[PDB]
Amino acid sequence: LTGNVYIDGLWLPGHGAPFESVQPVTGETVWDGNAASLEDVDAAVREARKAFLAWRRKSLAERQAVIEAFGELLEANKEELAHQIGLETGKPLWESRTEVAAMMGKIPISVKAYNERTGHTESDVAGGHAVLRHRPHGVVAVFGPYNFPGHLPNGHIVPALLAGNTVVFKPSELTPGVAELTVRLWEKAGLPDGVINLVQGGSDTGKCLARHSLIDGLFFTGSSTVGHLLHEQFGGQPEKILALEMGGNNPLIVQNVSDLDGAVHHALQSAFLSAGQRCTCARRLLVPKGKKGDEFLARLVEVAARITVAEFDADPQPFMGSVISAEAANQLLKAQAAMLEKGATSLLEMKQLKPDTGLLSPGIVDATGIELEDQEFFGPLLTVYRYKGFDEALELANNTRYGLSAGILSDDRKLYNRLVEEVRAGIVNWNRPLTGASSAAPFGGVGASGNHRPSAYYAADYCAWPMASLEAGKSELPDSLAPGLNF
């Protein structure tokens, strides 16, 4: 809890301008420090590069041993890291602890992924003895988002380090504290100097890191806009591997359910968990027009209006917490303002619960005939579209250039089978919340949600490249020579 950059094993003040992290409800300072400057960033990359030569030489078992020791340290400090997450984002403690448990779960599954997707295998083949192993890239810049400031950055860092890369970690300027605490745990774990490097800052720092000509890869979790800027910057430099994990405009269908509340639970989870700041949150809810659908929205609006929202450490825990800042909440109110002026109708009003905070109540708007923008965003603002044929549900589900999550709640397995056959989305759930995903499977969207470098289970794929060998044992003439070969 010092505010220092971390480079080649040493905590030092950054040379850039000071900034602070403020608690989204109380507005008080939770973290202050200096942004890393151009030459700090250059120093982190240059040192990460140096450490790479030795860190890649460790066995897989040596690198893994440090990573699980980091996992044991996560366990030993679970509550303190959960408390930092809650402080700096607004996420309630009950749910912050969930992020830390996932950071720990990331470790054994990454180890499994590495051996299966980028492991070591051997065969006797036509051209000789065949050997396949995978190699790290070098220095990878990791950019963290603010919604999951431990789990998501960790979802890059663990597979990247496990494979023999070194990391320059640039967290969001909204969650530097959680990151600094995480890197301190990597240190307590015994990670060698330079193998991980923390460079705090905002937009200047990230640009300096993104453009540094000596990073070998860049792993990004964050907004689709900035990720597209990154992809265009890297255009013409295929030598650097780029992994982009972006947002979505995720639809949830609800048609033909026999358990009213059970569906209203999964529907509420999908849209409002983490105050609607999970990348896979349902933003468009597709409900059948008329009789068979109207009751669902009523029980859903009833139960959604009883959602509790308070400080991350409320005396009894709330379901969800504040949005990231009082500003963010501000445009969320402008967002739903724009919608109604556009012709949509309010089912449940999103309200700012405390004067200058990010504490927002759930909001539900019906835009069934209204044309709204195709825009990713974080916040508890759910839009409903009513439809007639289930073929109309499919058409609306795909009415977006995003492609992250999609889902259906229904008793009828075949309505789910049709969605799976038709929807262009990376995660697609049946009778589970959209926000539920399995780190034991790939986690990536298509369309505007990725660049075909899915993460979680497939992170192994972008953390190490393949090297294939044909071995003989001694160069010697073959039994049948080729014509023209005269010895």
If one asks whether residue 227 binds its own copies (CB under 8 A), the answer comes out as: yes
Task: Consult the annotation and say whether 322 binds a ligand.
Answer: no
Mark 15-49 as b/e (b = at least 16 C-beta within 10 Å).
Answer: ebeebebbbbbeeeebbebbbbbbebbbbbbbbbb
If one asks whether residue 320 binds its own copies (CB under 8 A), the answer comes out as: yes
If one asks whether residue 39 binds its own copies (CB under 8 A), the answer comes out as: no
Calpha distance 252→17 (Å, rounded): 44
Stretch that binds ligand CCCCCCCCCC=O, among 129-137, 204-212, 451-459, 475-483 (CB under 6 A): 451-459
Stretch that binds Cl ion, among 125-133, 154-162, 212-220, 364-372 (CB under 5 A): 125-133
Stretch that binds Cl ion, among 111-119, 127-135, 238-246, 308-316 (CB under 5 A): 127-135
Site for its own copies in 125-164 (CB under 8 A): 125-128, 130, 132-133, 135, 137
Task: Consult the annotation and say whether 226 binds a ligand.
Answer: yes
Q: How far is the CB of 274 from ligand CCCCCCCCCC=O (least distance, A)?
A: 12
If one asks whether residue 462 binds its own copies (CB under 8 A), the answer comes out as: yes
Q: How many residues sit close enough to its own copies to count as binding (CB under 8 A)?
A: 104
If one asks whether residue 272 binds ligand CCCCCCCCCC=O (CB under 6 A), the answer comes out as: no
Q: How far is the CB of 456 from Cl ion (least distance, A)?
A: 20
**Can you list the alpha helix ranges (DSSP code H) found in 342-455?**
390-397, 413-422
Stretch that binds its own copies, among 71-79, 190-198, 232-240, 369-377 (CB under 8 A): 232-240
Instruction: For residue 17, give Cα distances in angstroms to 1, 14, 38, 169, 214.
Output: 18, 8, 11, 18, 24
Catalogue the E-assigned strands of 23-83.
29-34
Task: Give the three-class secondary structure for 152.
Answer: helix
If one asks whether residue 251 binds its own copies (CB under 8 A), the answer comes out as: no
If one asks whether residue 421 binds its own copies (CB under 8 A), the answer comes out as: yes
Q: Which active-site residues does the annotation give?
A: 245, 279
Question: Of 153 and 379, which CB lies nearer to ligand CCCCCCCCCC=O in the complex structure?
Answer: 153
Calpha distance 242→220 (Å, rounded): 8
**Binding residue (CB under 6 A) for ligand CCCCCCCCCC=O from 245, 311, 366, 461:** 245
Calpha distance 80→181 (Å, rounded): 9
Mark 272-308 as b/e (b = at least 16 C-beta within 10 Å).
Answer: bbbbbbbbbbbbbbbbbeeeebeebbeebeebbeebe
Rg (CA), the chain: 24
Q: How many residues sit close enough to ligand CCCCCCCCCC=O to count as binding (CB under 6 A)?
A: 11
**Binding residue (CB under 6 A) for ligand CCCCCCCCCC=O from 41, 100, 152, 168:** 152
Q: How far is the CB of 6 from Cl ion (least distance, A)?
A: 29
Neighbours of 438 (CB within 10 A): 12
CB of 107 within 8 A of CB of 66?
no
**Binding residue (CB under 8 A) for its own copies from 309, 323, 326, 460:** 309
Stretch that binds ligand CCCCCCCCCC=O, among 75-83, 136-144, 148-156, 181-189 (CB under 6 A): 148-156
If one asks whether residue 426 binds its own copies (CB under 8 A), the answer comes out as: yes
Calpha distance 367→363 (Å, rounded): 13
Task: Consult the annotation and say whether 475 binds a ligand.
Answer: no
Q: What are phi and psi of 217, to 5 degrees?
A: -160, 160
Site for Cl ion in 133-152 (CB under 5 A): 133
Task: Consult the annotation and say whether 223 binds a ligand.
Answer: yes
Report the residue count for the chain. Answer: 487
If one asks whether residue 64 binds its own copies (CB under 8 A), the answer comes out as: no
Which residues have CB under 8 Å from 249's CB, separation 6+?
283, 284, 374, 375, 376, 400, 401, 402, 404
Q: For residue 99, which of 439, 443, 450, 467 has the smallest C-alpha distance? A: 439
CB of 467 within 8 A of CB of 132?
yes
CB of 247 within 8 A of CB of 223?
yes
**Binding residue (CB under 6 A) for ligand CCCCCCCCCC=O from 48, 252, 456, 460:** 456
Site for Cl ion in 428-467 (CB under 5 A): none
Binding site for ligand CCCCCCCCCC=O (CB under 6 A): 152, 155-156, 221, 245, 437, 439, 443, 455-456, 459
